[PDB]
Design a protein around this ligand. Sequence first.
Ligand SMILES: NC(=O)C1=CN([C@@H]2O[C@H](COP(=O)(O)OP(=O)(O)OC[C@H]3O[C@@H](n4cnc5c(N)ncnc54)[C@H](O)[C@@H]3O)[C@@H](O)[C@H]2O)C=CC1
Ligand SMILES: NC(=O)C1=CN([C@@H]2O[C@H](COP(=O)(O)OP(=O)(O)OC[C@H]3O[C@@H](n4cnc5c(N)ncnc54)[C@H](O)[C@@H]3O)[C@@H](O)[C@H]2O)C=CC1
Ligand SMILES: O=CNC1CCCCC1
Ligand SMILES: O=CNC1CCCCC1
Ligand SMILES: [Zn+2]
Ligand SMILES: [Zn+2]
Ligand SMILES: [Zn+2]
Ligand SMILES: [Zn+2]
Lengths: 374, 374
Amino acid sequence: STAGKVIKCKAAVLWEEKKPFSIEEVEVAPPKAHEVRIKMVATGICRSDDHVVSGTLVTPLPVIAGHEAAGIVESIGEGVTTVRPGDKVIPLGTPQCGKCRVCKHPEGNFCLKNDLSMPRGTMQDGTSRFTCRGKPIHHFLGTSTFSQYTVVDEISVAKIDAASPLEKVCLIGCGFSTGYGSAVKVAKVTQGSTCAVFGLGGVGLSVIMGCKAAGAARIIGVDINKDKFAKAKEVGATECVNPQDYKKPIQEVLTEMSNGGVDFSFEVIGRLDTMVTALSCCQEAYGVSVIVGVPPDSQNLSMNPMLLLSGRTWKGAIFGGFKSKDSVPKLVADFMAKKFALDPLITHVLPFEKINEGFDLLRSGESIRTILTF
Amino acid sequence: STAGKVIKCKAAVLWEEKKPFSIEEVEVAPPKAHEVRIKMVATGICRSDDHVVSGTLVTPLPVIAGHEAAGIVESIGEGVTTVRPGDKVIPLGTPQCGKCRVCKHPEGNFCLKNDLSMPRGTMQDGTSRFTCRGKPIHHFLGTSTFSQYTVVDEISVAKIDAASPLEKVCLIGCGFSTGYGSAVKVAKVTQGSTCAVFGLGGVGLSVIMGCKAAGAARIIGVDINKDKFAKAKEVGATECVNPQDYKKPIQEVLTEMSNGGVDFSFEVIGRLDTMVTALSCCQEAYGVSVIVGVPPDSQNLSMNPMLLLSGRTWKGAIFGGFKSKDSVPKLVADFMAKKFALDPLITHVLPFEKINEGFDLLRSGESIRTILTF
Ligand SMILES: NC(=O)C1=CN([C@@H]2O[C@H](COP(=O)(O)OP(=O)(O)OC[C@H]3O[C@@H](n4cnc5c(N)ncnc54)[C@H](O)[C@@H]3O)[C@@H](O)[C@H]2O)C=CC1
Ligand SMILES: NC(=O)C1=CN([C@@H]2O[C@H](COP(=O)(O)OP(=O)(O)OC[C@H]3O[C@@H](n4cnc5c(N)ncnc54)[C@H](O)[C@@H]3O)[C@@H](O)[C@H]2O)C=CC1
Ligand SMILES: O=CNC1CCCCC1
Ligand SMILES: O=CNC1CCCCC1
Ligand SMILES: [Zn+2]
Ligand SMILES: [Zn+2]
Ligand SMILES: [Zn+2]
Ligand SMILES: [Zn+2]
């Protein structure tokens, strides 16, 4: 019926920065060799998608954004061996080619086939599968899930349990796994430790979930929006602090609260100043700080290297350190076995056609994750 | 003979920055409770001592510097239980009180009793044991080894093997242990890995020794003084590069040489620019960079946090991460069992009276470690 043919469908096209998405018809080419065309079922609104709109995260425009999603395979290109039509799948904003030095390394996950370091906004072959008004449109992170259909390279898609609820497990494609893995895999939070989490959105709440799963004794949530505190406590925060409530810098406050610095801190906002504050608030001799938030494009932070010389460890990670294709199906299986919850992250549900309202909810501070249904 | 009495002896006093040391008579008070008075036998010239002269490292003046040394206990104050008169000892620029949260933590070593974070230049009790021309003189790092006799707090001294050669093992008090541990304990260099070591002085050569002991396959030494390359290769470097020989930034050179970035890099100079270069040259997804060098006082570096977000780990350490009082005697025992060599680090041996000549040798690029003998 549609296999081998161009599909005309609706997508949310971003023609320029700082403008609403345009819901309009696009043409989606059939998949070439080692490509997969997916009928989207649900997609979450991640702050990184908003960073594309705001220019915080630079990728070529015009673009179909979206990268946190789940759908059903409509057709596969020649040579595809890991998914078949009808399979439930999660696209992966970080691929897993399985062949590069990073994929072969026991710890690495930032596969060298990624489209983040030097963005092209294309498929792996350097071309686009999307046309709109006769104009080629860029892809985003090899995923482009703000469309009723997308085409992704095989290395950027994972087959998941056929019974998965796609309107929930789409969060495993980005925000949940990123936050959870940042705590359990990247930081390796220890039982009885004290953690500080800067930023209590969908990703920060998932960091809290991971800290609690790791057995932290104290988990201090930090946010300038106190409306975020109730949910943070529900998922495991033992206390929350708003930096605006204090006359001293919050790194001082947190050092005093933790009797000399926290064991693990996480920056899950995307500001240069909070990256330095989060590093400073961990204990100077043995603390660990993990950057999760995305900094504004091309901007440098300033910091005193004595913060590191005393013994601190500072690291960052994409996607919680998880090797994407290996990890996503296992994380879905864990979700199906009730080993973590996703409902606390989902505050709003909207049809895809209301994407702009979903972004308004995020920008106003009212939502954690809005899930869009196609 | 001298016990309980003020000792008049020779010391090298630094009265002000950017001046030669003044070799003259000082008075060394007897040890108070939990203090140890030590007759010096040998002391090394570490770049950190020169940093005091140059103003790179700020500590109260006038001062008796020196912190890498070995000697023999002359007398002990009330309550001392860990050393006795006649014992061979190494003073510890980082103490090990055994009671603070850092000393109790399995990884931490930067004991909260240190005199580095907020330098006072005193004994633990806030007073000085040194007088010169009737003026009180400050201590340095709780050690002050540029003197025929010094007084140190018990938590800043380790008893070592009575058969130890003090003119060699003084290096275990700072330089050697710092570099070796930075590789084996802080970075945890792995078998078959590629390492880059910036700075080929006494500490950087000790990093190379540690990388080789850990089984690194490639160890790239980096120094602007090509005269340092021969000794670096003798102790394990597989190749050396001088940034001044290249038109491109050395981080780009090292990334190309390592086919995409090194596994472990070490900054063992003390420059902001080389700290950022060393971080950048490690592989972006799984590389680890360790700051060992001391930055100039109060200066901040500038860096792009995307270097960390992709997956790099950045850390620093004092004294190679070793808990000082536990580790120094074991490292001496290891040296006595031929587990590592110290002779490659020692290029000059001079009488203490030639301290200024020893510093000239360091500043001119002509020495690795000069050992001063009393
Ligand atoms: N490393 C990775 O793989 C990933 C990174 N990201 C990044 O993580 C960050 C968080 O993403 P979401 O949770 O979706 O965003 P979000 O916008 O829902 O949450 C951010 C939170 O930070 C708080 N905040 C903002 N400014 C603050 C300040 N100055 N001090 C304290 N709190 C402040 C906000 O009130 C908000 O609750 C974003 O920068 C996003 O781009 C997201 C997904 C994956
Ligand atoms: N973290 C810690 O516990 C310790 C830190 N230190 C610090 O480690 C550093 C090294 O100490 P040493 O080996 O005694 O010093 P050193 O002066 O013997 O060695 C430094 C080396 O860096 C090279 N160098 C200088 N500028 C350079 C540049 N722009 N690029 C490349 N190479 C350059 C020099 O030619 C020299 O060979 C110093 O900053 C010292 O204060 C020393 C001992 C303990
Ligand atoms: O949110 C998904 N991916 C992010 C990962 C961090 C850099 C920007 C893109
Ligand atoms: O060289 C010995 N100690 C150093 C440790 C790093 C800060 C300056 C002093
Ligand atoms: Zn995302
Ligand atoms: Zn790969
Ligand atoms: Zn030193
Ligand atoms: Zn201590």
